Amino acid sequence: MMNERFTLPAHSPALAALVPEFLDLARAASGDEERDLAVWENLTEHVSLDYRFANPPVHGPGDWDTYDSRFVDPAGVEIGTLQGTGRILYERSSDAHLMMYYREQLTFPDGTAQTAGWVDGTAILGGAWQRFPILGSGGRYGSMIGLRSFQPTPEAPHSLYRTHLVLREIPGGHGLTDPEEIDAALSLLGAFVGPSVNPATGNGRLEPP
Amino acid sequence: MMNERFTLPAHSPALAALVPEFLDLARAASGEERDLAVWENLTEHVSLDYRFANPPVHGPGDWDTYDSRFVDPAGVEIGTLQGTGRILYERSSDAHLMMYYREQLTFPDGTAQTAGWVDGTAILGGAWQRFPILGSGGRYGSMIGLRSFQPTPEAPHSLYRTHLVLREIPGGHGLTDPEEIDAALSLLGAFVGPSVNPATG
Numbered sequence: 001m002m003n004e005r006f007t008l009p010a011h012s013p014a015l016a017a018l019v020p021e022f023l024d025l026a027r028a029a030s031g032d033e034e035r036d037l038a039v040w041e042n043l044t045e046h047v048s049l050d051y052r053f054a055n056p057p058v059h060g061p062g063d064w065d066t067y068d069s070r071f072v073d074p075a076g077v078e079i080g081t082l083q084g085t086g087r088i089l090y091e092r093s094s095d096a097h098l099m100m101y102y103r104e105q106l107t108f109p110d111g112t113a114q115t116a117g118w119v120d121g122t123a124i125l126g127g128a129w130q131r132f133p134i135l136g137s138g139g140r141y142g143s144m145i146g147l148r149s150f151q152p153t154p155e156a157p158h159s160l161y162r163t164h165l166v167l168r169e170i171p172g173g174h175g176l177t178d179p180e181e182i183d184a185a186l187s188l189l190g191a192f193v194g195p196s197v198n199p200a201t202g203n204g205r206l207e208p209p
Numbered sequence: 210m211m212n213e214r215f216t217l218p219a220h221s222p223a224l225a226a227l228v229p230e231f232l233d234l235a236r237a238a239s240g241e242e243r244d245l246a247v248w249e250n251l252t253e254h255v256s257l258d259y260r261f262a263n264p265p266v267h268g269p270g271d272w273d274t275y276d277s278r279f280v281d282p283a284g285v286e287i288g289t290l291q292g293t294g295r296i297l298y299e300r301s302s303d304a305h306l307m308m309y310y311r312e313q314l315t316f317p318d319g320t321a322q323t324a325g326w327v328d329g330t331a332i333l334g335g336a337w338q339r340f341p342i343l344g345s346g347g348r349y350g351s352m353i354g355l356r357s358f359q360p361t362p363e364a365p366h367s368l369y370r371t372h373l374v375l376r377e378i379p380g381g382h383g384l385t386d387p388e389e390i391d392a393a394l395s396l397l398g399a400f401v402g403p404s405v406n407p408a409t410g
Contacts, residue, residue: 005357006235016228026215090297101406149214191396192217206295207272
């Protein structure tokens with residue numbers, strides 16, 4: 001008797017199950033429920049960033065970048081690396097902030113994890129902390145979700161970031177393999193940490209700036 | 210003691226509380242007793258003001274506003290809607306036109322609102338579009354719901370087939386600030402929206 005158009009996709013329960021675990025990460029990271037946990041705090045992210053302008057003089061839609069990162073802990077030990085890609089897709093109606101979609105692959109000696117989501121490009125210039133959700137994708141991290149928080153250092157905003165990473169096992173894993181559903185989970189969790197995609201304006205319209 | 214940078218914003222528990230209720234909407238609409246409003250197989254009469262950025266081309270920069278009338282099968286109007294949408298970009302994977310919409314719902318006894326992503330290319334193809342709803346006034350202020358519509362193939366820009374459900378949440382959804390409302394609408398849209406930029410080869 002259920003209306004098809006009110007029923008949600010098959011993966012929705014698995015998605016929903018990520019939500020409480022995500023809210024729990026901070027507490028689990030603070031020393032503590034015992035599952036496998038990986039916490040790296042006060043990392044130095046050595047970023048080598050190839051930033052391309054589409055209309056060279058100033059940032060705008062169409063711009064893109066790639067970057068490679070090295071995660072080095074306070075003692076100088078490299079704990080993992082990262083490949084990232086980003087594209088500027090549009091300007092918000094309300095304030096013309098530069099909206100960018102990013103995807104990243106984190107590679108640790110014992111496994112891999114991935115990231116995707118929205119970044120306010122205007123805010124990164126201003127020096128804001130950014131946060132991406134993580135889904136584990138292989139090895140030790142395959143059963144894990146987490147959070148990546150990074151801030152571009154004032155001295156070298158394009159080469160050194162300060163970064164914290166937390167990944168935590170979910171019992172029996174998050175259960176997502178399809179890229180479609182992985183992207184949906186990353187959108188769901190990003191809702192808590194990511195910028196607003198297009199805030200309501202004054203004039204009741206979403207016209208372009 | 211906790212890392213500020215791993216701690217989620219204060220609204221996170223209220224957002225999290227929306228999730229099981231949202232998953233419960235389909236079952237609730239088909240018959241726990243709360244206040245519930247279901248309108249199925251409405252005819253949505255749409256009046257559309259569409260602006261082009263490069264006039265002959267449908268593309269990024271286009272935007273529109275529209276007025277909608279919800280008429281039940283018996284010909285009674287049960288509410289109206291004002292909406293706005295913009296074409297923001299073409300997906301890397303398949304160049305589909307991605308768009309974003311915000312809408313305000315007005316019923317005789319209250320108000321509700323909507324926002325979310327639309328694949329403008331797939332909508333041509335006859336796919337259903339779905340936006341989460343947050344109540345914003347009157348009877349519905351304490352409610353969340355779902356709006357699903359499909360443009361009629363014979364009159365794709367003026368007639369839609371539409372279903373609406375809104376359901377009371379115990380103690381209201383608890384969101385008043387626009388930023389938290391936008392986050393809740395994004396959170397619930399993750400379940401129903403198109404993929405915004407699928408990974409490429």
